[PDB]
Amino acid sequence: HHWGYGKHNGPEHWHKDFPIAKGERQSPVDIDTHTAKYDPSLKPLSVSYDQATSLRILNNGHAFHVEFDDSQDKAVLKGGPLDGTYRLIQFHFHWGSLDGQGSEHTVDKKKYAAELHLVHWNTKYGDFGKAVQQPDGLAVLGIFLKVGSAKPGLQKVVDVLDSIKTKGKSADFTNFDPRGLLPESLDYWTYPGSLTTPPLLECVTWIVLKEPISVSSEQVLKFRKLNFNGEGEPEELMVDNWRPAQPLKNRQIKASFK
Ligand SMILES: [Zn+2]
Numbered sequence: 413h414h415w416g417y418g419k420h421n422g423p424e425h426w427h428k429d430f431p432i433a434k435g436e437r438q439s440p441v442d443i444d445t446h447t448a449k450y451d452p453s454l455k456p457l458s459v460s461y462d463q464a465t466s467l468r469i470l471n472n473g474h475a476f477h478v479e480f481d482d483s484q485d486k487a488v489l490k491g492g493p494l495d496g497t498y499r500l501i502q503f504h505f506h507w508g509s510l511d512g513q514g515s516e517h518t519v520d521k522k523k524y525a526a527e528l529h530l531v532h533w534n535t536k537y538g539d540f541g542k543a544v545q546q547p548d549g550l551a552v553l554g555i556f557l558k559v560g561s562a563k564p565g566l567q568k569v570v571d572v573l574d575s576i577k578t579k580g581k582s583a584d585f586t587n588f589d590p591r592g593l594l595p596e597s598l599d600y601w602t603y604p605g606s607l608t609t610p611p612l613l614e615c616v617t618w619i620v621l622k623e624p625i626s627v628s629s630e631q632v633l634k635f636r637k638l639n640f641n642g643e644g645e646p647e648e649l650m651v652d653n654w655r656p657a658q659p660l661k662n663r664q665i666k667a668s669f670k
Pocket of ligand 1: 504505506529608
């Protein structure tokens with residue numbers, strides 16, 4: 413028995429094992445576009461993914477993660493509200509059982525079909541493990557997905573999902589370019605928050621892009637064929653692996669655009 417997204421172990425139950433779930437800077441949150449403050453001092457984001465080296469894709473029972481080689485500054489995020497260099501370690505998604513839900517963050521209460529999270533850690537801390545224990549340890553880039561036209565750059569990911577259907581399965585996933593998942597504009601909102609899955613540590617500087625990317629119904633449908641369970645167990649479809657919006661509390665959301 414452990415945390416999950418079911419009726420008996422879902423987000424509403426997480427606080428029992430992870431008290432920080434009721435903390436002061438929990439994520440996700442609803443982004444009120446009219447209350448967000450334009451900050452002229454916010455620098456443009458600098459995304460350098462030209463040398464990215466993907467290694468593997470795996471189903472960890474909560475979602476599927478694409479892992480990268482983070483032993484050198486191959487794929488990094490700089491600028492914006494960040495101080496220093498952050499290395500990309502993995503990316504994963506959050507999606508729903510229907511196109512009307514799936515994203516973790518919401519914009520003026522609007523929910524998207526899914527949300528992509530590109531996780532980076534502050535190189536000043538040496539490794540991911542040390543970084544999650546710091547208030548400025550991680551930088552997660554959040555991108556919304558809406559259903560419409562297909563996204564060619566996402567197809568390589570959808571085609572390998574069959575090989576990692578159940579919890580615990582992993583497969584080689586080399587030469588994947590994450591640049592094909594980015595929208596045209598890099599305008600964003602930013603706030604101090606946390607990881608949206610246990611341990612729910614409050615070590616993240618969220619950077620949520622304003623422009624969503626479009627994916628086809630067929631592409632998101634394949635996400636929904638994954639399983640929460642491991643092989644040889646009752647099939648439980650991996651859907652609605654998202655945490656509901658949390659109280660903003662004493663926090664301000666800043667925007668890089670007016
Ligand atoms: Zn996530």
